[PDB]
Amino acid sequence: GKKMMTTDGNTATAHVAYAMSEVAAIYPITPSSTMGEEADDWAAQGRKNIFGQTLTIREMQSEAGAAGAVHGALAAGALTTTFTASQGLLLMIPNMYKISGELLPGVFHVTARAIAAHALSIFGDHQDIYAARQTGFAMLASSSVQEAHDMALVAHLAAIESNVPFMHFFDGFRTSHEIQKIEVLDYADMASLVNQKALAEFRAKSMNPEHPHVRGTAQNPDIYFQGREAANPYYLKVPGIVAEYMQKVASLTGRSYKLFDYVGAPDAERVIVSMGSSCETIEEVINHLAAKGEKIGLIKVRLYRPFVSEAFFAALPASAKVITVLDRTKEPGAPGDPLYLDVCSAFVERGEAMPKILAGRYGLGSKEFSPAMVKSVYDNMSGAKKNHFTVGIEDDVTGTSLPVDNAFADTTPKGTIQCQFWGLGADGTVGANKQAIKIIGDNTDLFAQGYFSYDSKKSGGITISHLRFGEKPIQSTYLVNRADYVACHNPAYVGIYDILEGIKDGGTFVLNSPWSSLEDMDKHLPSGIKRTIANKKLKFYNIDAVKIATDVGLGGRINMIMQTAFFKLAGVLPFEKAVDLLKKSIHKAYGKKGEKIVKMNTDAVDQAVTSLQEFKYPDSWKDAPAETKAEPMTNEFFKNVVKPILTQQGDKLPVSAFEADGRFPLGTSQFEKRGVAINVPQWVPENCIQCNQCAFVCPHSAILPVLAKEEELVGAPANFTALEAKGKELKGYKFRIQINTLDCMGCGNCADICPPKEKALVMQPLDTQRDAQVPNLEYAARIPVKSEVLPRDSLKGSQFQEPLMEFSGACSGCGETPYVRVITQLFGERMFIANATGCSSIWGASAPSMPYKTNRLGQGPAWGNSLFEDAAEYGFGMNMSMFARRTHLADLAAKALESDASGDVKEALQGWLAGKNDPIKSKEYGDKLKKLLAGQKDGLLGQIAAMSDLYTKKSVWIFGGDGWAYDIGYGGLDHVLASGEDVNVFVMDTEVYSNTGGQSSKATPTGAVAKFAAAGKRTGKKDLARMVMTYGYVYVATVSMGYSKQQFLKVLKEAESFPGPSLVIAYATCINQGLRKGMGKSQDVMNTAVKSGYWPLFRYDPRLAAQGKNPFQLDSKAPDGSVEEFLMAQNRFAVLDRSFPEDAKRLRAQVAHELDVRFKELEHMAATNIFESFAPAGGKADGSVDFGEGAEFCTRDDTPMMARPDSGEACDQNRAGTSEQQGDLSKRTKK
Amino acid sequence: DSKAPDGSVEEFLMAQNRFAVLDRSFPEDAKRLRAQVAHELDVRFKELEHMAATNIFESFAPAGGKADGSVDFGEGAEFCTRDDTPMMARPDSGEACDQNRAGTSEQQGDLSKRTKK
Amino acid sequence: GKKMMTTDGNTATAHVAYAMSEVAAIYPITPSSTMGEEADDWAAQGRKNIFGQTLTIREMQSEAGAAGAVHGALAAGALTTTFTASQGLLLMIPNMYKISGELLPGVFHVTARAIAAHALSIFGDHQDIYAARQTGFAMLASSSVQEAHDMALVAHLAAIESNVPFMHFFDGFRTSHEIQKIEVLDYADMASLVNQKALAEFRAKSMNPEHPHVRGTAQNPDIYFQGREAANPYY
Amino acid sequence: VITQLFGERMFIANATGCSSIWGASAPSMPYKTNRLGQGPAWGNSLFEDAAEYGFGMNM
Amino acid sequence: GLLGQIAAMSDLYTKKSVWIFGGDGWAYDIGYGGLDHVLASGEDVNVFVMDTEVYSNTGGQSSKATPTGAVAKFAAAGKRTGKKDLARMVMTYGYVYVATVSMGYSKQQFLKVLKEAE
Amino acid sequence: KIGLIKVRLYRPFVSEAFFAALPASAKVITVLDRTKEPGAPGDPLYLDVCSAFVERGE
């Protein structure tokens, strides 16, 4: 049986993957997490595979552990699979050779994603899949959603019968997240294609002590080579098995395929050879140009490996005179990319006709591949014939890109309605778009396509959706730039984004805004927009969805109003059936609360259909006066690079506009001033007590405390109200808390924690503050920061320091940024950061916004993100460099001390040398030296001068999340902390893989609800703190800002100052945890976290042990009993109590017990007078000694492994018994 | 399952070349590192001894609960549980929710009582 | 000064490696283990490199760990190196993309060894090196003990001036463990062939809060592609 | 001895290293079967995945 | 029928015993991240670590399992960091069976552990 | 009449440097690869060589 189904690549292949698999070991990673999360859910729900069994899915610590688990399963006789991508696929490589080597029917479903080189990317291309092309895996590619399903089935069937592992792959995001109405097969149909004899043999040859065998042997040069060729027969037959099933799945669905498929003109002279979702668009362009008489074609490659040349030439037209192979990868240095090379070897080996063959690279990192680009490619063949060209960018540095005429006529099928939606994150737009897909598709005989472009901004971001509808198949695997319907669901975008680009003439444009009058419309709508609305005779429909949404009592949410706009003006369904079929869905969804809520969404539909009246704009718009420019201060980087990017114009940014090594300058987020908050805090100098707690808490540094004297507040606004500093050091100074209304995300934390009964901070509408604050901020921002007035590491004094990390892309009230910010206020000027992959690297390094900044001297955190699994290692590397280099300096300094260096130079040189590793001193004598050696450029001194950036002691930090620390990168973390070296790791524990969807980590508590914890995690929270404390010499400590900022500053001090390994774990609230009262209660929740005893604070300081003192110190008090109310306040716990109350009660009970036992444990750990000692280092002294020297019996074996240059000496190999035994045998044979 | 150190540490270590070579080439360091190891095994034992005599110990449970039927961590959530990022993007995601840019619940509720009109 | 002496391919390259490097993260793996052991020993011994400093070597928990450290040391303006092969090399693939992506002058010295598939093998062949031909590393092959020394030096000298990471490799056992009577170069000589400006610039562009910059961003479809092409001149 | 107790019904995920070298250096196989043909199902995946390899056997 | 299928699964009837072998190099270092995770899975697997306190097979290199003052490659002057307490680290879970043995000291203790752990 | 072309630099693969060592007399050339990529249309060094001739266009 069949079944029309509208879904995306991920769900489409996952549907087939689940049915054909008994075991699955996965690890989350964008954009394959979906599939992995599908399986788990479906299994939990009770889904059955073709064996009537629910899939057994487990989560590992990494894709390496995954691939390893799969191997074991496959070896143990179970049909296994896994879903991965990019960085994840790279860590599976080693196992892949093993899995292929041991001929196992394994199958990988990977969403082709870019590899992180100059920069990380979560978008699609073939860099990863190509990196595994020599693992011995079969590679079957799909070019569409429908194909995703189809090729996914063939993959499994072929694998089972070929005993050769398959890698089914499809374009990440471009196919995986694209939704289309496709056909899927029943689990029964699939199960009936399986080769039973093969399945029986697979299980019979598998590992089992009832009939064991040995795999994974170690072979010498005598047999390795032969054993490696022993599988040739298998690889020769796989192409046949693959074709076989393409024909069998064909007899059931009606969709045929070949290892290589040809499309286009029978006598095409110019053929393209591509692979992936790109082929869909090519064919679209082919149908258009070929119908016009053009002789061009295309060869779709399905099976990339093995690469059967026969099948290639099968789909290749003899009329082909020129054929360009397109690779969606980039192998620096190669003479050509993958596919290109394979194709070349094809013709050369055919040793006959030789058609001009061109090479072309495209789509890197989901780069758009428009029909125009497909046009540019076919023209290059009938023209310049440029080779090794790029398409989609402007290569003005090496000039390899192709000229693209964007004025290319639309090639979408006839009768297709392409739509565009510009919504704000969380307004319902997308969810409403997806509903419009299910409805229309499941009630009409139209094809539906959906794709969405989100924003790097986790809060208040733009979301331009793309939807298409037609009577003919949709092959438009690229954005919509010729829409018939354009809708802006946010009036803010009006004057900041090119909302109407390429909008077809006569096209309708419905806008969301309270400008129902022409006066307002003209006052807020730009001339460029007005001019366009008129010149194109657009059918502009305004609508006050907010007002209309308030009259019906929908809270004011415009999601159900703009949805009604679509069905009425998009023109896909007849007005009647269109609006009618909608009301039917209103009942489908919702209905969560009687007909009351259902009535509010029905009334909205009608009153809206009424409000939806064309805005009769005047013909005077055709020539409206364009305003004048007035952009504030900015760099030539925020102006020439970041803004063009922030304004969705980055694609037009040529190659020459970037750093070859892919680096960015700091403080670029200093001009973003997004201003997407709804409500902001209002300082009230009548209640304020000048404590600096509001600033200390802000997750975006949107609060700037000002401490200046009337000497600096001369040319200031009359409303720059300022109190008079409180305290001793603060007497004549004037205090003030300047709210940064534009950079504020309106989370509410500051006001929520402001001490005084009568809050000195009150939340008010942004617009009712900006006009008076923005100008005061630009002023207060010019007031010198008083850093030498109070103790740098003091609560009230730390906020008088410069925050070198502001306005990041983190969510409102993030539980992470608050910490890092204050961390820069203590060491920022002299620290390195090795940020592990994840949120910490997302809200801090997502181009083009860079929150980290430099202070008044240009000093700031030297930031860097290597990978997700090597944060510690990475940072450990930075530590080795500094050591190696600083030690170098010190040795030259010593040299100069013996030379004829001046008296002054020798003093500072002598001094620095004494405090080389002392922040204060190293900086005191370091600066003196700079002054003294200034201008020097010869001899030792000349070299010592050129190293001023090594003088003051640097501070190396490792930023990561629980996922990194507890899982993927725990191994490196553990190892580095053992190194016993001066490094500082800061773990922001959100108890869950955040930015990837909220997957369960070993840091996730008991009974918590996360991905792969679908019913509350049934394993206790891994105790990372106690595990590392066992080292004895590693400084460990836990913190929780909301509970005690004072203890947090102390920790940072004691940790960073410790002359060795430091591990600090911070309890960070996150939106994945789902706080009932919002992230504005984050600080108050961190507080409860400690009091309840859920997250007890403590510190293990080894140097205390070095002085007879117990290295363990408890910073919190025994549980208070508010634990239950603490867990039930977070949805990640409340959900179970609603769906599975029985397990919920038990799980929350087990947790309380868990924290009750562990605390008593910590207490006794703080009471005991028995602890591990501590010793820095000392000793070394040049000289090495091998463990073999002076040994009586051999210390090494005969093996080629222990063999060394100096080895080979005669020794007692222990084959004559013991020394005594030998001695006695000698006495027992006297003679 | 074993008893407290018997002091044979020195002879034990010196009887093995991996330690004896260090003593022959680095007499000074050797003695310190050997005297250090001895201190480690002595401390770790008393340490291990408390474990054997503690009145507090982590509970245990085979396995249970789970069963059929799953649930998402965002269902019922008052505020958004997923960001605008393409990463947290899922098939079912996309619904409207409070993105925490309006302030805390009580803050919002009181912000209305102070406007009414 | 030219100097005759007998040795295996391993020490021959280690000889150069040590001199030309300042930092090194290493994990043991046959048949390249000999080089890392020599660099470590000579370090303890107190041997000075071209900069007249002892090599700073550390051992990680794995090659994926060594690569991570090797990446950080290079991003921190320090001449780094490592020795690996087969399975070890494969665990370095991820970082190799980063190291070359950030145009760091790293230098890998690998003893070409077979990959574990139908069976394991500590013996030599080009299965490992090839598995990383797309990582963006320049690849220099030496065909004999004498060449192991020469290419080893060229590799370091080129990497420093081109900013492209080099991977010096030679057949495991067949060369790494084949001893011959060859000619090596004093460290002084090797030092005089270094490009001081290139080296000075490597110190400059590197990480340091005194003059910070951000590396390892996350880029969308709008610019990621162009950024990947920005290094075409260097290659 | 471990095989003298569970040998006839155990799977073995052996991490590369001596135990894998003396465990399965071709053509010498130390692990054998008992009078009934039962014996340890030995397999060496890679050096860094011994636990996940065995875990998968468990799955 | 069912019996037909059942019958073909005789090799599954008897409860199997999944074991995992490996030296200290594996358990303490390169494979630790994996061992730690698999152990925390709570499933029925047995891990037997033959602690040699050094990377024997490859030439006796140092590992986190190497003792203080122990002379090994990469520890040319005796290791200057203590032996990693893998045991106490895993014992924090509370739901994992952990034990140390030494045949020379007691064969009875060793057998007792295999019996209990398995 | 035989010869051999030793490849010192495999990456980047400079087609020019390659031909600089290719004797015009060459009528038959066999490329040797010390590896095996199952299913591949050929092994690495080989593939790179073919690309060089197809692009030399002679």
Ligand SMILES: Cc1ncc(C[n+]2csc(CCOP(=O)(O)OP(=O)(O)O)c2C)c(N)n1
């Ligand atoms: C080898 C590899 N596997 C997977 C990923 C994808 N990934 C990036 S961040 C992340 C989760 C973040 O987890 P965590 O460390 O807990 O930090 P948080 O986001 O919660 O701060 C995942 C699964 C990757 N980048 N590389």
Ligand SMILES: Cc1ncc(C[n+]2csc(CCOP(=O)(O)OP(=O)(O)O)c2C)c(N)n1
């Ligand atoms: C990725 C990878 N890195 C390094 C090696 C090489 N190697 C194999 S065994 C070994 C020694 C560690 O052995 P161990 O587990 O300590 O056991 P032992 O031989 O000492 O009993 C090393 C360095 C490998 N096979 N794969």
Ligand code: SF4
């Ligand atoms: S938290 Fe309140 S009392 Fe404290 S400095 Fe801020 S506004 Fe003033």
Ligand code: SF4
């Ligand atoms: S509401 Fe939140 S983001 Fe805004 S100033 Fe207060 S703490 Fe900062």
Ligand code: SF4
């Ligand atoms: S940690 Fe959570 S709250 Fe912070 S940026 Fe990530 S998803 Fe948002």
Ligand SMILES: [Ca+2]
């Ligand atoms: Ca420290």
Ligand SMILES: [Mg+2]
């Ligand atoms: Mg997390």
Ligand SMILES: [Mg+2]
């Ligand atoms: Mg060992």
